[PDB]
Design a binder for this molecule. Structure first.
Ligand SMILES: N[C@@H](CCC(=O)O)C(=O)O
Lengths: 235, 235
């Protein structure tokens, strides 16, 4: 198998599910005591957030690209960035490090098009919803049309993420509000819904979404595994 | 803070607690949004465990020293090996990678002499319990001697580590068993018990012990945080 390089610590808690799912996918596919060949670089998030909060995305891309190049030196053969929001600087990493870059939106695009769909909705942070980096990569690589909530809903959905889901509160009222938004977007033509982080999936089980759900982080880990074994899109 | 290099995947289930506790310890000490600078090399355990089986210890030493050098090339400033057993080849790693090597025994041995004890019980793989690499280290460096369970219990203890804990079966049958073995060794004058496999902390809650507990994963991760911040023994 190929060795995967992980760019993580943003946050460390959200890195653990990449490591878990990658190892489980390898152990499922290879059998027995097989585990994943993984190189991980975990940042001090403090230093990233200081750049992000001042909008110094060039500094963040310089830090993350230097981290990728270190993994490549240690023998990684592909790069996974274990955060949606930091794909703001994916172009910095992809253009500077010659290793295949497995963009989070590309993994999801492959899943969306493998479900026969052209038109989806995206729920996440307001930043992730409103910036070009996620939805734009989907169109550029796939022609996938990506619907977002209106401005008032974006603000409510975000507030729910940072005031509740982030602090462990998965409440029915928030659950129902998301399912209502998903439903509105379904009636506008959305054929599936991308949940931009693990926690939205924690709040909204697929039973409660009227649309097929694409959990972008779990999908990302599963695509890493396909890459390491050279399967499907990576054969 | 100094970047710690972790050598893990032995098993990957036991690498996760290292990653969690190191981040947790760094955030406790630095506060705010601070997380750990960690480089991790996670191996395919199938290769390592095959070598152990075959008695090809020099080969595992080769594998692990090269992983360490690869972490050093990516920026690691200290080496932590997330496995007691593989400390049998710590000398090939410590000699070919000249980063500070935080030997798992040393931190435990510091903690044992620290409580004013000298003779303890040792639970671990059969290698870790039966052989000299580990207990010879505690003797050499601290004059500490260990009592180990009888030959039948050692076989059962080991079968539990490799068939259960490394594949993620944690059960009260196993746990309870480890509990009873402790009782016996206390009765034999053991002043404390070292959980000398990094996944006996993933099975037994500390408070079933009739002897004081020295958990090597926990102590090792604490020693990593102290080295990273140059605290306590690290100056
Ligand atoms: N958890 C065991 C791993 C044994 C092995 O690597 O075979 C230990 O710390 O030794």
């Amino acid at each position: 198998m190929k060795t995967i390089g992980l760019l993580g610590g943003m946050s460390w808690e959200s890195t653990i599910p990449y490591y878990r799912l990658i190892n489980e996918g390898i152990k499922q596919r290879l059998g027995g005591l097989h585990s994943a060949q993984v190189l991980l670089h975990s940042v001090d998030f403090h230093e990233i957030e200081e750049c992000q909060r001042r909008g110094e995305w060039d500094k963040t891309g310089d830090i993350l690209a230097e981290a990728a190049l270190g993994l490549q030196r240690a023998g990684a053969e592909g790069i996974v960035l274990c955060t949606n929001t930091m794909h703001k600087v994916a172009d910095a990493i992809e253009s500077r490090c010659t290793l295949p870059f497995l963009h989070i939106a590309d993994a999801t695009g492959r899943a969306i098009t493998g479900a026969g769909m052209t038109r989806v909705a995206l729920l996440g942070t307001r930043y992730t919803m409103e910036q070009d980096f996620y939805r734009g990569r989907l169109t550029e690589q796939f022609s996938i049309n990506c619907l977002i909530p209106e401005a008032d809903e974006r603000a409510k959905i975000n507030q729910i993420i940072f005031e509740e889901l982030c602090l462990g509160q998965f409440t029915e009222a928030s659950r129902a509000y998301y399912a209502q938004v998903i439903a509105r977007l379904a009636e506008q033509g959305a054929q599936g819904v991308i949940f931009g982080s693990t926690e939205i999936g924690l709040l909204v089980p697929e039973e409660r979404s009227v649309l097929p759900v694409f959990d972008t982080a779990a999908i990302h880990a599963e695509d890493a595994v396909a890459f390491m074994l050279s399967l499907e899109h990576h054969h």
